[PDB]
Design a protein around this ligand. Sequence first.
Ligand SMILES: *[C@@H](C(=O)O)[C@H](O)C(=O)N[C@H](CCc1ccccc1)C(=O)NCCC(C)C
Length: 215
Amino acid sequence: APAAVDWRARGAVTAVKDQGQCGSCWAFSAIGNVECQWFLAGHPLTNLSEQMLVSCDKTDSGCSGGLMNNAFEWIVQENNGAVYTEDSYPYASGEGISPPCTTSGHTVGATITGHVELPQDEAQIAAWLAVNGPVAVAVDASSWMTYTGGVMTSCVSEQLDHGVLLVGYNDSAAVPYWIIKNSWTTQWGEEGYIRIAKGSNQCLVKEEASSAVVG
Ligand SMILES: *[C@@H](C(=O)O)[C@H](O)C(=O)N[C@H](CCc1ccccc1)C(=O)NCCC(C)C
């Protein structure tokens, strides 16, 4: 609903996690999106497993990287729509390797039926996010190692390299901004979050936005 929406303030977002040394950003973005969409569909907020994707999704490349849209499709097409709880399939890729996939000994925490890819337009992405909840997006994270807090008003925007989760925006602030959940622990940014200026494709935020559909 226009002016400002922060889904963290509506019990919809889980705590900030840590990908460690694994290039598993794609999995953190995809699962963060699924956790928020599951809650918004009328289910308790449950922590879900990134490790399921890193180890079992063979259409992506584990710790070498992947794509959120491929991850969503693997869940539906190969894993019978199941997303395991984080407690039953804990993160094990912190050192930079993906252990072999185990197909049993886990509990289903959520299911999805598909995914939608959103327009490459920030006004349109805010409109969808405002009603339907957090969006999985890709950014150029090149300058993000120097981010110490505040609204980043200028961002290197050359090549997408990092998937993250858009959880809100605020258009009534002095400079309109987006609020993004990252996976580099609470010690980075504003307790694991970053705010970037909205309306000028900062960090190429509008280019690869999508969301899972639970129905
Ligand atoms: C992100 C990170 O851990 O910070 C990963 O390194 C990662 O997933 N990188 C991707 C590039 C390498 C790659 C692409 C496609 C298939 C295999 C490897 C990357 O661009 N991630 C962003 C994903 C968005 C664009 C969907």
